Every structure is written in C-alpha cells, then in structure tokens.
Amino acid sequence: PEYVRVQRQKKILSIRLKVPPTIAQFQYTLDRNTAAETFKLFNKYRPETAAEKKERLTKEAAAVAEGKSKQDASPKPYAVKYGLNHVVALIENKKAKLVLIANDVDPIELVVFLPALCKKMGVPYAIVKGKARLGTLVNQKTSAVAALTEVRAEDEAALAKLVSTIDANFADKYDEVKKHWGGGILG
Amino acid sequence: XXXXXXXXXXXXXXXXXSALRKVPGYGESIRERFERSLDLY
Amino acid sequence: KFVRAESIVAKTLATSREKERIKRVSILEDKKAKNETQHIASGKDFILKITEGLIREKTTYDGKPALLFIVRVRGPLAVNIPNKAFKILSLLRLVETNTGVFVKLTKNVYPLLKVIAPYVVIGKPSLSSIRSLIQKRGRIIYKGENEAEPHEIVLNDNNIVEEQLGDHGIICVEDIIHEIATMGESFSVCNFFLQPFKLNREVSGFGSLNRLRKIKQREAESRTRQFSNAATAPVIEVDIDSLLAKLN
Amino acid sequence: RNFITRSQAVRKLQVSLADFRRLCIFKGIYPTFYYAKDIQYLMHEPVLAKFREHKTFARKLTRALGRGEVSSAKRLEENRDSYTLDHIIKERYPSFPDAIRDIDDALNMLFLFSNLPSTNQVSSKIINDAQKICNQWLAYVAKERLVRKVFVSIKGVYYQANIKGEEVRWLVPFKFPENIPSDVDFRIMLTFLEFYSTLLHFVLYKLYTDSGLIYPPKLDLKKDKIISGLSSYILESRKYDSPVASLFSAFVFYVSREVPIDILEFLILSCGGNVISEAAMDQIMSKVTHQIVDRPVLKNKVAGRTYIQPQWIFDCINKGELVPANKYLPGEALPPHLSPW
C-alpha cells in the first residue's frame, strides 16, 4: 500500500536528518516506574464523566423536585486539567503543580514551547509518552497535555515526593542532552 | 469394546442389572446427548 | 524473571501483619485455655452472621458440636502464608483453593478458627446444600481392581461404599449425607472417606464480559469479608445456602 | 443455487460462524449445503441484528476496560438489551399441541443439565434455572398425578406422561457426580438448552394458567432447606383419572434413609400418598403402614408396618394395579422387570 509505505518511510527521514534541540527533548522521557506511579496518581484524580455528571445531576434534581432541599454543601471538585489552552492558562498564574506533556502530537508546534515555558515559570513539567494514555485518564480520545493543581490533604505528601522524583529523574538526567542536536544518523 | 464406538455403545447398552443398590453413574449419557445434537445439526 | 522491587516489600509487610495477629491469637487463646484471664480484652467468644450496608448479627459461642462447612478463599493480596496456618490448612486439606470440607465444631476446634479466618469462609449449611454437594461432587481415593492407585472414583457405587464401611454398617451415600448431617454415630469416618472436595471458580474470567463479574465480586467480597486482627475477632458466618448457589 | 457453502452464507449474513451455528439450530435451519430461500428467510431477523449489536457491545466493553473506566462499563452492562427467543418459538410452534409434541426432546436435555454439576463453561445460574424449571415440571405432574408408565434402567428413568394428548417420554438420570467428558463441546448443548428453556418456559406458562393456578410457583425456603425438589414448591389454587391417578389413595408411606428419595418421592406424589423419610427428619410416625426399604436386616421389624422393596411401586404403576408384596418383602428375590415397551 501507499500509507504503510509512507508511515514506514516516516521516522526514517527524521532520524536521518539533524533535528533541532527544541525537539528530541521529547522521547527523552519518563522511565517505567515513575510514569506508572504518575498514572496511579492521576487515576486517583480522574475527572467526572458525562454519565456520572448527568447521574449526580438527576440525583440532586430529584432531591429538589421532592424538596427535600437536603443541604448546601460540597467542598470542590478536584480533577486533572486537560484543555490545552486551559493548561497554558493554569500556567502564568502559576497554578500547575504538575504537567504531563505527550511526546507525540502531529502538530508538534502546539507543544514545543511548554517545556521551556514550565522551565522559566519553574513549573514541574514532565514529558509523558503517548497522548492516548492521557486521553484515557481524562475520558477523551487523546489529550496531549495534563495539568494538575488541586490535591486533597491525603495526597499532598505523595505529590511533593513525586515532584522531587521527577525533578531528580527528568531535570537532572536530560538537561544537558536537551541542548544537543538529536538525530542526523542515516538509516 | 473391540468394535467402533458407534457399535460399542449400543452393544454395551444392556448390562447386568444387579439391584437397587448400584447405578454406575452415566458416562455414556452425555455422549449420547452430544451425538443426538450432532444428528440434529 | 526479575520479579520487582515492590511485591517483595508488600509481602513482607503483609506477613508482618499476619504474624502479629497470629501471635496475638496464640497468646490470648493460651491465656483462655490455661484459664488465666487477668488482663485481656474479653473472656468469652463471639460469632458474626452477615445477612441481608447489610445486617451483621453477633452471637456468643455455644460449646456445642456444630456441623460446619468450610470454604477455602484465595488469601489476602500479597501474603506468604505462615507455617502455623500452613500446618492447619495442611491438616484440613484446604490448599489448592476453592476447596471446602465438612468439619465438627467443638471448643477444641474453635481456637484454630480464629487463626485461619483470613483464608476461608464459614457458615451454617443446610441439608439440601450438603445433599447437593455430595450428589453432584465428591471423589474417593480408592483401592481398585488393578491400579498404581492414586486412583479416585466419583460416587456411584453404594456397594463400594458398604464394602469399606460395612464395619460401621454404612451403605448408600445418601446415608453418608444423613450421618454428616446427623453426626450421631460417626462423622469422622465419612470425613476421612470423602477426603477431597473441589469447587469450580465462579467466574470464567479472561474475556471482556467476565472481568466485570470479577470486579463486582471483588467489591462484594470486600463488603462481606472483614479482617479484624484483634484476637477477639467474632467468627464471621455467611449463608452457605447463598454461597453454594454460586459455587455449585 | 439450492446448495450454499457455509462460508458463503456466513459471509453474506456477515455473522460469525459459531453464531451461524447458533441460528441454524435455533430456527431449525438444516442442510455445508444450505437452501438459498431459507437463508433468504434468515436474511432479515432482529436476533441476528442483536447478535451483531452484542459484538459491537463487547467491543465497546473492551475499550471501556482498556481505558480503565469501570463506571461506563457498568453503565453499558446495565443499559443493555437482551435478545429473546420467544417470537420464533411462537411462529415455529403456533399450535400448542405441536409444542406438546416437541416438548419431549426439550425436557430431556434440561433434566440432564439439572443433574449436571457446576463447571466453568456451564454457569451455575444455567444449572439453577435448569433445576428450577425441572422441579416446576415435576411439581406440575404431581398436581394432576397423571403419568402411567415407569421404567427402571441402568440408563435413566423413562417416564411418559398422559397429559392433554400424547404421553411424553422424559428421563432423569440419577443424582450422581458424573465425570465430565472432554470430548463434548457445550457450545451446542447450551444453545439447545436456552432454546428448550424458553420454549418449555412458555409451555409451563400455558400449562399453569390452563390448570388455573399461578405460573410462578412459591416455595417455603425452609422446605427447600429440607429437600430441593418438586415438594419444595407450594402450588396455589388461582376428577383424577382412574386408576393410576389416586392409586394408593389415603396411603401413608415410610421411605427409609436407605432408599433413593427422589424418584420414589415423585412416584408417591404421582400416587398422591404421603412421603416420610428419616433423612428429612434429622434436619429438624403414627399413620405409617409401609416401609419402602432395600436392606437385608431390618431392625425394629414392626409387624404392623409393611416391609417392601421399591420395585412394588415400580411394578404397581406399570400395571396400574395392586400386586402382592411377598416378592417385594426383603430379602425375597424379584421378577426381572421388563417394562411395557
């Protein structure tokens, strides 16, 4: 076929040529156990689905329909944040405690400023592998970004050690090789 | 028992009925059901 | 294989918890049996009964020989099973899980129930349930015509039964059901005779639909089974008439 | 054009082949050489559509599991349609005596599955529904008390019932743990099972409403805890044909713990007499006249109580009439019974 031929010829012409160092920061990404614990963290903070939302809405609406106005109390919803402009919006306050960044986006240029932007804003970013795995934890097909701001007190101590873990595993390991021109070796 | 299973089963169908006390527990019956189902299909 | 770094820690912590509760059970039951109740929690024992948040009623223990049917549960999450409980499950033949057995309950029997509590499930059985178990399951290890003889045979021949049970005069496996329910003359003859039990797993599992069943059953088992680790743990009893509707 | 290859038909229908095997057995579509017009009839069927919908449903279940979203999978499983079997049962058997004619094979499988122990491939719920429907079927017979024929065999217990036309030849194998055969495939017998289950289900509906009583039969739970039988069910409200119905009228039995309780219980219920077994008693004897027992040495040896080996009941109902019990007295030998066939 043609499309199989092109998708195999793709990633050959990339690595054969010199990639700029603002790329290939991607795939210098998080290792196995740390990404695993990051997913264990963010599955604790799944956002509400449309079905669960509408279900709670029907519950409270049937409550008010009886009326049976039970109380007026709810702390806040805490969830991951996943809209890209919303993720950037949570930076430049700053509010992002952790950011996950997908390596694979076909318009890469949507994403390329985010490591430098969280670098200058001091936000603990981490480059995650695969936007589908982001979409799974956020009930989308893909997400390509994952910001997290608000955390319960049960999880806040896990958050800080995860931040220190990432800054040890990502910011220390890959920082100098981030500056280097990747690829260029023929296929 | 020397015959084929289609010939073995009907030939081993009748056996020495002793008394109330023992009934050997029906190995053949499930195979008979499956064979009848194969006859329908 | 490279196993992992985490499982080796979790097993150690879980074995620590289990050895601690087992030592608590052993010390408390030694002080009860030696009758040196000076500074302990309680003197007399208790029994939980979960029926249908669901209603959980407690009784004091009655020092009366009660027919129980035990059902081996898969133990807790990452636990190496300790050799004290391994000894008891070895005696009661409860390894190779999904495996119950009928047992006699006395006050000498009762202390081990507090020990092996995180690995089995208990309750009051009914005659129809005992009947169904024996008429549908059960194999006897048997010395046969000409065998190498690790040889097991399903329950068909009542004359094989009255052969090896003619000294007690026990015929006709219906009467074995009747005397397991009765325990008037001899239960333990039937108990050593019926020596293996096997129960199927309730959910086939691997496949799209049955994983839902597995998750819902793990949630149900989390609701039902309770792990006190107090050494004054009330003995949890469940409807085996409900349970064998699932497993048989 | 008369013969169609199974691959051709299964790709024209766009169904999986195992489900095509379901549908052929399910509608009674018979031959890898199949009638074109029968496949044309099969070409539009909502159960086929719901099968394909179940395939897509399981695919959505797989993506629900692979995304890990448990609650949406719960919503999918709860909000799920079930294909029923019932319409092609009615348009397959419009005339109810044709269902009475073809209930005969339908009983036999369901009785065998009611005997069968719980496995992985056959669910207990399957066996629970089987034993429930089979106990219902037996409990209906003991209402009118109308069979006539009895057969004792190494292969089964063949009873044919004289009900609303033909005598119906159902068999129950004895309640023994059976070694499972690895040779068989359940995937066919489960389809036969479900088809016969739904068919016999609606036939039990017409037989319970036609007999004028409630189609769900209530049971006392503690009566079921005594014995899981037809006698567990109580049968509500909203003569007997001579002689076999109300044979042994006003007659009190004492079946032992030694005897097989089940088929003798059902025969006494076909007689209308009472059942007293000591096996039921130890769960926890004024009018008892007769012991059904098969033992060499009888202990209490009451001269008032009649001691009988059970073939008397097997021979009296095959004759419809009373016979002397000197042969049936233990330990006298018995006539080699050859049933009326």
Structure description:
By secondary structure, chain A is mainly α. Helices cover 44% and strands 7% of the residues of chain A. The longest helix of chain A has 17 residues, at 50-66. Chain A is globular. The two termini of chain A are 21 Å apart. Chain B is 49% helix and 0% strand. Chain B is built from two helices and no strands. Chain B has helices at 5-11, 28-40. The longest helix of chain B is centred in the C-terminal third of the chain and has 13 residues, at 28-40. Chain C has 248 residues and is α+β, with helices and mostly antiparallel strands. Chain C has one domain (1-248). Chain C has nine helices and eight strands. A three-stranded mixed sheet of chain C has the order 2-1-8, with no helix packed on it. In chain C, strands 4-3-5 form a three-stranded antiparallel sheet, with no helix packed on it. Chain C has a two-stranded antiparallel sheet with strand order 6-7. In chain C, helix 4 runs antiparallel to helix 6 (174-182). Chain C is globular. In chain D, strand 1 (158-162) and strand 2 form a beta hairpin. The longest helix of chain D has 25 residues, at 186-210. Chain D has 13 helices and seven strands. The two termini of chain D are 45 Å apart. By secondary structure, chain D is mostly helical. The chains are: A mainly alpha (187), B mainly alpha (41), C alpha+beta (248), D mainly alpha (341). The PDB classes it as ribosome. The entry lists the keywords Pre-60S, ribosome biogenesis, LSU processome, ribosome. Yeast nucleolar pre-60S ribosomal subunit (state 2). Chain A is 60S ribosomal protein L8-A. The organism of A is Saccharomyces cerevisiae BY4741.
